Design a protein around this ligand. Structure first.
Ligand code: COH
Length: 153
């Protein structure tokens, strides 16, 4: 569980992410795709993209970035009480998209990398630690739903 002071560090940087949801969303997905090419293969709608320049140019990819970050933001603002928000997400990612838990660890790394690039002053070590904990909490709860359904993995 995160303390109230750790949640404050998380939401303070998130308010910054919200000033440019689309730019952040795009940097995160591109970092994920370049760092872990096997993840791009799960998206039939983005599979045709080969270069970083093509990725940057895709308006649809940018629109999906907003989708992801808006859902994540709704979760973070619940400060751990995210049952109603996390459940639909785990069911679709487990049974429809077939996303292994390890891929959620990859996107978490991408999120941390991008927040660091874009917000050094509001993203020092302490904030980085709180963010990691929040993303771990997210993964832990998702993993529990996956197991129940028979997808732990
Ligand atoms: C590596 C693949 C991968 C990862 C790590 C991932 C991680 C995350 C993530 C973690 C921070 C968040 C908050 C979301 C949030 C979403 N994802 Co994904 N998703 C993934 C693959 C997908 C795919 C595939 C779809 C469907 C895309 C499409 O065709 O529209 C998707 C759809 C969604 C949607 C649309 C509704 C739905 O289908 O549930 C939301 C919201 N998500 N996803």
């Amino acid at each position: 569980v995160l303390s109230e002071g750790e949640w404050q560090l998380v939401l303070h940087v998130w308010a910054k992410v919200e000033a440019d949801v689309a730019g952040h969303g795009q940097d995160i997905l591109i970092r994920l795709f370049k760092s872990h090419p096997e993840t791009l293969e799960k998206f039939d709608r983005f599979k045709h993209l080969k270069t970083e320049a093509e990725m940057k140019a895709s308006e649809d990819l940018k629109k999906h970035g907003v989708t992801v970050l808006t859902a994540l933001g709704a979760i973070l603002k619940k400060k751990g009480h995210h049952e109603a928000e996390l459940k639909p997400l785990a069911q679709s990612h487990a049974t429809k998209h077939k996303i292994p838990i390890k891929y959620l660890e990859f996107i978490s790394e991408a999120i941390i990398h991008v927040l660091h690039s874009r917000h050094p002053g509001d993203f020092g070590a302490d904030a980085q630690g709180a963010m990691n904990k929040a993303l771990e909490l997210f993964r832990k709860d998702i993993a529990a739903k996956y197991k129940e359904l028979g997808y732990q993995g």
